[PDB]
Amino acid sequence: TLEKKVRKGIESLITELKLMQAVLSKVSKVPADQLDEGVKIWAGNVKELSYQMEDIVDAFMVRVKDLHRISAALEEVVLQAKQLAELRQRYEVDPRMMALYTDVTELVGIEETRDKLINMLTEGDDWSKHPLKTISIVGFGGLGKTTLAKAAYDKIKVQFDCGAFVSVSRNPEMKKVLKDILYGLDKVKYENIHNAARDEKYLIDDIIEFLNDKRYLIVIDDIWNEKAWELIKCAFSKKSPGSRLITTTRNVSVSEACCSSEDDIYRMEPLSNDVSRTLFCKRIFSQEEGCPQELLKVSEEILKKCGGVPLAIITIASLLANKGHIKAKDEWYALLSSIGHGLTKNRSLEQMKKILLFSYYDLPSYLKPCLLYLSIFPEDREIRRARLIWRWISEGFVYSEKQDISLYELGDSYFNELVNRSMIQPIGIDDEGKVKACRVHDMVLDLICSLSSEENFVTILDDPRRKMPNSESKVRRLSIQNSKIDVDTTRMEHMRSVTVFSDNVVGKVLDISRFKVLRVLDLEGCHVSDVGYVGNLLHLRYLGLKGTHVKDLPMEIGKLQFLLTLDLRGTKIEVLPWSVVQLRRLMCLYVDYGMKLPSGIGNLTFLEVLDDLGLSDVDLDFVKELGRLTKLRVLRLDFHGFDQSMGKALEESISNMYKLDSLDVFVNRGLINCLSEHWVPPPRLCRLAFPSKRSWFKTLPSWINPSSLPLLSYLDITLFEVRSEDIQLLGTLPALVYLEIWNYSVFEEAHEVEAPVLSSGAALFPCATECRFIGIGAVPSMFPQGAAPRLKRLWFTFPAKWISSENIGLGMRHLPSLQRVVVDVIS
Amino acid sequence: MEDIVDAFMVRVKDLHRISAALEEVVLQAKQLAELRQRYEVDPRMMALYTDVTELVGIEETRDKLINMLTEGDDWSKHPLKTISIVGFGGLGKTTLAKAAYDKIKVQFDCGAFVSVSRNPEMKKVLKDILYGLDKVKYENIHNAARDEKYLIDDIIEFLNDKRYLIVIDDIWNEKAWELIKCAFSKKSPGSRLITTTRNVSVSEACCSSEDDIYRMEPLSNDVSRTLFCKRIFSQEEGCPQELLKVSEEILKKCGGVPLAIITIASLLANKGHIKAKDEWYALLSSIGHGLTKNRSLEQM
Ligand SMILES: Nc1ncnc2c1ncn2[C@@H]1O[C@H](COP(=O)(O)OP(=O)(O)OP(=O)(O)O)[C@@H](O)[C@H]1O
Ligand SMILES: Nc1ncnc2c1ncn2[C@@H]1O[C@H](COP(=O)(O)OP(=O)(O)OP(=O)(O)O)[C@@H](O)[C@H]1O
């Protein structure tokens, strides 16, 4: 009856959504420089309609009284889209080229870095008989990559026969690039080469035939989208000893497509603090620095902001001193406040903003919003990547149709794709084995915040900013920050998300239940426990309550039929309500071992990651129940009171799981009567940790074999005894990037540190960067340096009575950077 | 709409439902109309520049081809003849032609390796033929734009009293080739032509005799095994001993196309057999339903 017309209109809305998203993606490709203002205004209005109809369709999906409301809203938004239609019909060089021409005696700190680039390629030019090699230089935004290549280039040209710079832009024309290569080789024979119009191929043949019996040193820079470089590499495919190539790029996934060797990849780092200070004082300051003595702290704090990027500091210095330091200690602070939120809205600085937006424009779709989402988080802090992944999934930024992907690995791939585009610095390694958190450069972060605020993507309340938009109704994302004064929340009815950063004003001034529709709720670090209204929120996906003093949670959580996250670390709650099996969709459950889980967990079939499951006073059915739901990828378990044949029951029921990637079991000072020696492990596994040290195994587990579980890269194992064949067996394993073994009896009984030996094989360690042995003697005279090619640190124990022995054959420099080690010695 | 029409035509009470469906289908047609109005290099070219000492099995077929066209070179007074090579997808038809071309080249006075696309521009093709014949006299021939005719005459006059061995590959739509044939119409004994195409029905448009049409066949199982192991493995195939069965089964699906084998060998060795017995089963199972949606496989 009435349901049929709305059920029919919904997919019409969906088709319109697809068309609008297509045109929005097309119009956002062009830089906001060639795009006329009329098309841009129309695009903004289209974007607003896009949000409104997404909200209507989502309301329909979650709800199905209300049908009348949905129908009325649908007719209204149709009228709006119609009316917007006829308005539109009714009313209708490279910025970095100059840098290339800069005075040589204007670059500070260049010579040493240039020498490092030269002698990593010309060391084989001595005996220039080696096969040709390419040296790739990587970096982010602009930090000397092209200049350094030219300094090196202009230095070593007497000892070759040819050579040229060629640049490749964002969207090259291959014939143009090839004509540029031909022109630079010889400008006489190929003087009018840009007029000849053959093809992409005959001129490749000509360039090949030209470079026979010659050493040249061709350098190509700014190569993006590796598929473009696979054309040029065919021009360089005949044997030519003593010839070399240089490549510069912002994509670190294209550099390994060159030179096939990680030692040839040149990661280059920002300038050091003192070098950056010297450059900064060379531009503004004439010859001395001892005059101010009052803005020195200001210069320190400014140089900290730019970090090390020769570009940022060059631009800021040019802005700061037009003629004899036209500004002093007041507008310096005004600039400092302006950066972070609004610095770029200025003059002579917009030059560099295009150089930074190059990378943002090169991003494909489905990644522009993911990058723009970073504007939510504050200026300088590490951002846990798991938080970003779950927030992205809950927001709707991640989606697919393949059904062979668990929609989480997809988000991880998006994050890694952001990393390799040289836009966010990854730092640290988490407990799951991947990047822990990420940090974004200060200039880039402030620049993207402005770009996001050009539309209504987010809204930030900041004391330095202290600014509000004119339309309170059209607010979707809010980021409360240190500001705690103007907390008006009246006319934000369709609020997509909200998050609060370390504020005690929350709750007493905030009223969140008033947000009838809400998709994620993030409450890191707050001190509020009054959660009794989340039952009213039915669109919620992400609910973060880490460190929130939440003592208890409402019984009616089961109503939140759509839900994907519950983070409950650091909370005061110790028992979950029974109304949690009622949840049908979930992917993560971050709980601590103290809390007690109600029975019925086996119904949460869609669960993807489980963390810190406490097994205390558990019956057999509950232990067996975890095995029916097989979608886990990460599982963390600890226990105190079930150490019986139930252990073997669980150990067998785990093997039902076929998608694990990590595992770790925690137990106090006991033999592991859980893992049985006749049991198949999951086919896929990477981490397999065991962080307890008071615990031990009697023997090396039998199921540990090179045959099964071939993808391991981490052990953290501990055993009572040790054998000289166990180490050899561990050497049969393929990857095992990380190594750690503990000898329990050594630290607990009167046991002597013996010297195990690898008798069989040659290397048994192709790739193990880290190796740790505690209570086990790993003498470095176990094999010549041709055994473990990559091993940055090694730990072992050396008894003092072996000083007089002859088995201590160290002193030679092994292949990896193994000259830093402090071995624990025992008398 | 076509379902509505067929329903009416077969049926002729149903008039009421048919009419209702008619007006509502008109409704979606109109609605979609205004909804729409509201909003407004060759992959196989790089393969040509591949290392010679990587091909496996080219010599036997290449020697057979050379002596089936060069057999009359002794007493080089036989009239010119053409050889068509027929195949599907990638079976080195182009590579084999170049392998033969690079060997018997010193014993001709001219020669050109010229390609034709799906939709050729005849002026471009003939300019390419001219440029390959002599790169000095006809250096900037691609700039000059006379017509389809005078440059054909230029070719004909240039090919007076010479033996050339011109090879033209990837001819589709024989109506294209019958224009090129007029370039080679004067008697020129001791000179020959080589033609490749994925369309067998345009080969009998060439050479007018079945004995010259060269059907070419996929690789044998042994040669396919050698090429498959040479790309992935280091030097010995008997080292794994445990994915050998998976290897032969996955090789059976490619059959003998040096292409499928080359793509699978590249995709299956990212860095020294990235994993075994699991991803190889993934690629065996992924044939049929989703293997195409993958990475660096789109190039084929
Ligand atoms: N050591 C240095 N001393 C002084 N100025 C420098 C130094 N290195 C770079 N610059 C200047 O900083 C600007 C950075 O441009 P650069 O040549 O680094 O671009 P790039 O590294 O190729 O980055 P992009 O990939 O964005 O082109 C240029 O003006 C350059 O001259
Ligand atoms: N016998 C061989 N040994 C090794 N590699 C080969 C062999 N034959 C072809 N290849 C490789 O496989 C691909 C074959 O290209 P091919 O010559 O088949 O194109 P083609 O026959 O003209 O077919 P298409 O109709 O696709 O153009 C190239 O990558 C070639 O290098």
Side-chain angles (χ1 to χ4, degrees), chain B residues 201-249:
Chain B
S201 68
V202 301
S203 287
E204 61 276 60
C206 295
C207 70
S208 73
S209 296
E210 180 73 50
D211 62 347
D212 301 334
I213 306 283
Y214 188 94
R215 299 278 207 299
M216 82 165 258
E217 280 314 282
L219 294 175
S220 70
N221 278 320
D222 291 331
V223 179
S224 60
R225 186 171 319 282
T226 58
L227 190 154
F228 193 81
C229 85
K230 204 163 151 283
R231 289 315 180 81
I232 303 171
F233 285 37
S234 66
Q235 291 293 110
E236 296 84 6
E237 54 266 19
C239 288
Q241 186 66 42
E242 49 88 18
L243 52 84
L244 195 145
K245 186 257 286 181
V246 189
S247 75
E248 53 202 290
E249 293 179 353

Side-chain angles (χ1 to χ4, degrees), chain A residues 24 50 59 138 205 208 233 256 266 287 293 295 414 416-417 424 430 456 502 505 526 543 606 708 742 777 786 793:
Chain A
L24 283 168
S50 167
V138 301
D205 186 74
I208 290 171
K233 69 162 161 34
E256 70 275 16
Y266 188 97
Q287 59 87 26
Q293 295 329 114
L295 55 85
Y414 284 0
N416 291 316
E417 181 36 35
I424 52 158
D430 62 352
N456 290 318
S502 171
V505 72
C526 294
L543 182 59
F606 277 141
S708 68
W742 276 61
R793 296 283 75 79

Side-chain angles (χ1 to χ4, degrees), chain B residues 44 47 50 54-56 58 89-95 170 198 219 227 231 258-259 262:
Chain B
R44 40 199 179 84
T50 189
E54 281 313 350
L55 278 282
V56 304
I58 61 134
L91 287 201
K93 290 179 302 316
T94 291
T95 67
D170 202 357
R198 174 188 302 196
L219 294 175
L227 190 154
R231 289 315 180 81
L259 195 69
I262 270 316

Side-chain angles (χ1 to χ4, degrees), chain A residues 96 99 102 106-108 141-147 250 279 310 355:
Chain A
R96 17 215 196 98
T102 195
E106 172 53 64
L107 306 166
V108 305
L143 57 100
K145 274 173 309 331
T146 40
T147 41
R250 279 191 188 164
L279 191 161
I355 291 43

